Amino acid sequence: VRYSLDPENPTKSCKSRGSNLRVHFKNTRETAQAIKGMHIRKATKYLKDVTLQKQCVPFRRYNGGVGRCAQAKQWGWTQGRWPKKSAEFLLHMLKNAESNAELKGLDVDSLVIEHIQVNKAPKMRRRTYRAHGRINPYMSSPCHIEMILTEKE
Template identity: 80%
Template sequence: MTRYSLDPENATKSAKARGSHLRVHFKNTRETAHAIKKMHLRRAVRFLKNVSAHKECVPFRRYNGGVGRCAQAKNWKATQGRWPQKSAEFLLQLLKNAESNAEYKGLDTDHLVIEHIQVNKAPKMRRRTYRAHGRINPYMSSPCHIEVILAEREQAIARPTEEEPGKKKVS
């Protein structure tokens, strides 16, 4: 049993999933995960599929050096965005795993929300490339660890509407 960085508020109403040493870029995955945090599960899955189809972009806020601008980032009040295919794929697989864990626990999958999602750096993997004059340079990859906690949200209580809001009491 591995330790998560956050314990869910109500363990019976939540489901978890995690992946370790995943060979997907840390920076792209961090930005993609940040975009789907606090989303409903159905919306997050639809968003990630739209990212793969280039219909919606992932806004790049922290790791945005050299990232080009795109018009789709305006929906997020940002200017820079990309469509990280592999990160979207890995996150979709992880959300599918967490959803099946929730289903196994008997939770209602229509009311699941991504309560917590975190991407951490994993140890770098080394390869080498051969350069001119007998030199060797490193080819490093930046894998990551991802953890997700889905929680079942209770139905929000509707605010009662006031009758005749225009009248004021005069004393």
Template identity: 60%
Template sequence: MTSPVLTNVMPFFTPASKSRGSYLRVHVCRNPLSDMRSDIPSCRTLNHQFKNTREVAAAITGLKLSKALTYLADVKEHKQAIPFRRFKGGVGRTAQAKPFGVTQARWPAKSAEFVLGLLKNAESNAEVKGLNVDELYISHIVVNQAPKQRRRTYRAHGRINPYMSSPCHIEVILSEADSTVKREDDGKKVARLNVRQVARNARKARLTRA
């Protein structure tokens, strides 16, 4: 089995052979809006269940980094659960899924532990790049299926069945949140009218002109 390798894929092209001068393309699902304000840790051929890791990634998308770290640590201790929305066949129900608006949830400790380590690695990379760690949030995270790893299991009457594993690729983009500036109050407030109110005002205007 190939062990997962944690890489930082900021260079979009990496030299494959200096003698031939060829290049090996490093595929990323999304390029950050700003390289100076983002960090992209990734992992290839991760020997973790694709379906479980995908649900973990979906649960933390858009969260602030500090909140995501706390959430995944709670999942490992079964204090909070990961809602299963897509790959939910045969998944049991639990009361911890109620805050997410679903009934099915689990505690995929192995996937949560790895994603937690990946986020901590990204946090360290962000500190090296001089980013404000307190303002980082998970702007993009994607989990893709990797080539299945093949084993075999021996059955009765001399048969052999495949015994496959489902590894995955994972990629995260951490970005600094934009600072929001409150609009200055100039005393001119524009009233927002719905369609019915606009029609009523138009009808009153026609009656007044008549």
């Protein structure tokens, strides 16, 4: 399809997109603002240390009630968290971006992540059962995430 902000040079740029996939929106938004502008082999290595809880993800915007961890000092912040389901869905797609790069005849040793956005998908619902005969929803909030990779040279 058509993305947000077509890159300045499409010959030496690669891209991926993942639609309608079930993560939390808010935690995936903030593991993507950690790796924006980051090189792919650093981003692939940083995302492993989130799932192994050796290096965290600072929660900068959607941070209501998010507790504090010492690994958030590298980011200049206080609050941080380690979303492992979110760090696998945009690591399984970061492989897809370097799977598309070698089909486009591009070098992966200089690919950086220029553009990455997460925005919301339609919420799919199920319902819970509260006091006094009441129903209230467990609405799930999945997301469309979307990324551009560019060689620097």
